[PDB]
Write a protein that binds this ligand. Structure first.
Ligand SMILES: Nc1ncnc2c1ncn2[C@@H]1O[C@H](CSCC[C@H](N)C(=O)O)[C@@H](O)[C@H]1O
Lengths: 265, 265
């Protein structure tokens, strides 16, 4: 008699909230997708073990095309759950699935979970200072995406930071790295030459948020473009004008160039 | 030798992640702060009983002035947990505390949890479209702060949504309602006449996020300004131009008027 959208969190199976676990343990059927993001700290088995239910995984197509044929039909006579990495409604199009649920006469509920969108708080950058966000997508064929480049520009002009979700092709097991994302951004700089992303632009990389030992680094592109930030997933951030306290955290915690301390007011 | 920054999540004692609960249980000492925000759906006692540990509450002064004298000493020789509502380090002042830990030769780890900053995804508004964030503060005495008005203006100007955290007098335990916030914004409009917030402005109200039954309502100020959204906490959102999918969700799930489909898209 219900459908639950339950978030699994940032890194491993324990990133689920107690609410989400207690509820998932009591559902009759459990579905999940693992294409919107990457949980590099667990495995399907451990999750199934933690929840104590068989977890039927779905592909982007099963979801996007047959959600109402695969999941909804059961939600009518049973308690069904749909799991996702991080928060189920952040940087996905899952929200519209609630509309399908409604249109099918199924009540739906949402259980949140830690999201990279808020997790960036660990970088020491003020969350309220983040502007519009964007995704650095893989180029395909002769199509060259540049929108994400303009987002950075627009925010930087207001002194705001930019959060850059990195692309992903789960079926191919391809998880864009920050290094890759930086390369792509430099290329776009050649094209537009708007002085947005150069070798002297300060950036911050967060890898494996949620793990006890995430990788947090801040520095100039020229020096990080070649750095190894560990296994994915990675997120890239282009800070705006920094508050002194932010710079302090970047230098003290993310080992950034001690020079960023002398901010330009 | 270890300090754990553990987030308590959105609303009640079950909004902590399994990771945060287990880690908290294995800690020798447990501290908590409830001045950046509160956990409206639970009590200190319900949290203590869930953690199975005595929890010492610290004031703003305790943390901001004597964190190194109250919390860190015990960390140098034990496993200490510092709990906070939401997701740690989303609150501006938190990050600075990791530096203090370092200064004392103490290791600190962060255990994330759902933040309202990311939970707003349940409103159907695309997360990437959220711009700079602001807080609607209660005017007091000869001080009438209004920057939050300019934040809406700059965001909406760029087609971006604006998340407004509503003021909370933690000690006094008073919550600013969305209605109160709307009234304030209508007054700030009469003073700046910038056409940023009026009776015809479309807004979204999210109450008790995290709860299984939050209140998600969308509509024009003139219709919502005196509507009862239930118990706190309330979050107010002034969306920018809407993508049709966002609008369809607001109408179908948040009871928004069909009118927004042609006026705000
Ligand atoms: N633990 C983590 N560390 C760093 N980046 C992460 C991450 N989890 C997700 N991301 C980033 O976000 C992208 C997925 S976008 C979907 C986000 C998800 N709903 C959430 O709430 O987090 C990834 O490609 C990656 O760039």
């Amino acid at each position: 008699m219900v459908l639950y959208f339950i978030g699994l969190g940032l890194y491993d199976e324990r990133d689920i909230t107690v609410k989400g676990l207690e509820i998932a343990k009591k559902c009759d059927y459990v579905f999940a997708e693992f294409y919107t993001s990457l949980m590099a700290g667990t495995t399907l088995g451990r999750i199934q073990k933690l929840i104590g239910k068989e977890i039927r995984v779905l592909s982007r197509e099963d979801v996007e095309l047959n959600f109402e044929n695969i999941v909804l039909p059961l939600a009518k006579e049973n308690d069904v759950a749909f799991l996702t990495p991080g928060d189920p409604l952040v940087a996905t199009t899952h929200a519209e699935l609630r509309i399908r649920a409604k249109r099918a006469g199924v009540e739906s509920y949402v259980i949140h979970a830690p999201s990279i969108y808020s997790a960036v708080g660990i970088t020491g950058l003020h969350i309220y200072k983040f502007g519009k966000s964007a995704t650095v997508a893989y180029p395909e064929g002769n199509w060259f995406p540049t929108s994400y480049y303009d987002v950075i520009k627009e925010n930087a002009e207001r002194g705001l930071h930019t959060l850059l979700f990195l692309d992903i092709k789960a079926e191919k097991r391809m998880y864009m790295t920050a290094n890759e994302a930086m390369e792509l951004l430099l290329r776009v700089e050649d094209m537009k030459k708007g002085g947005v992303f150069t070798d002297d632009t300060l950036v911050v990389v967060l890898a494996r948020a949620g793990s006890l030992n995430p990788t947090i680094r801040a520095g100039y592109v020229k020096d990080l473009i070649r750095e190894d930030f560990g296994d994915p997933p990675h997120i890239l951030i282009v800070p705006g004008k920094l508050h002194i306290v932010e710079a302090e955290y970047l230098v003290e915690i993310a080992g950034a160039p001690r020079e960023i301390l002398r901010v330009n007011v």
